[PDB]
Amino acid sequence: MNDSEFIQLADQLYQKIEEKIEESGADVDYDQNGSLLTLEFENHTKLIINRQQPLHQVWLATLENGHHYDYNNGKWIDDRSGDEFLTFLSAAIFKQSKETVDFT
Output the smallest distance, CB 32 to Eu ion, in A.
5
Q: Which of the stretches 7-15, 24-32, 48-56, 70-78 binds Eu ion when contact is defined by CB under 5 A?
A: 24-32
Residue among 98, 100, 99, 104 nearest 85 (CA): 104
Estimate to the nearest angstrom the gap between the alpha carbon of 8 and the chain centroid. 15
Of 23 and 29, nearer to Eu ion (C-beta) is 29
- The three-state (H, E, C) secondary structure of 37-103, written as one string: EEEEECCCCEEEEEEEHHHCEEEEECCCCEEEEEEECCEEEECCCCCEHHHHHHHHHHHHHCCCCCC
Of 1 and 63, nearer to Eu ion (C-beta) is 1
11 lies in the binding site for Eu ion (CB under 5 A): no
Cβ contacts of residue 54 below 8 Å, gap of 6+?
Answer: none
| Residue in 11, 23, 29, 79 binding Eu ion, rule: CB under 5 A | 29
Output the smallest distance, CB 14 to Eu ion, in A.
11
102 lies in the binding site for Eu ion (CB under 5 A): no
Of 26 and 89, nearer to Eu ion (C-beta) is 26
Kindly list the residues in this chain that would bind Eu ion in the complex (CB under 5 A): 29
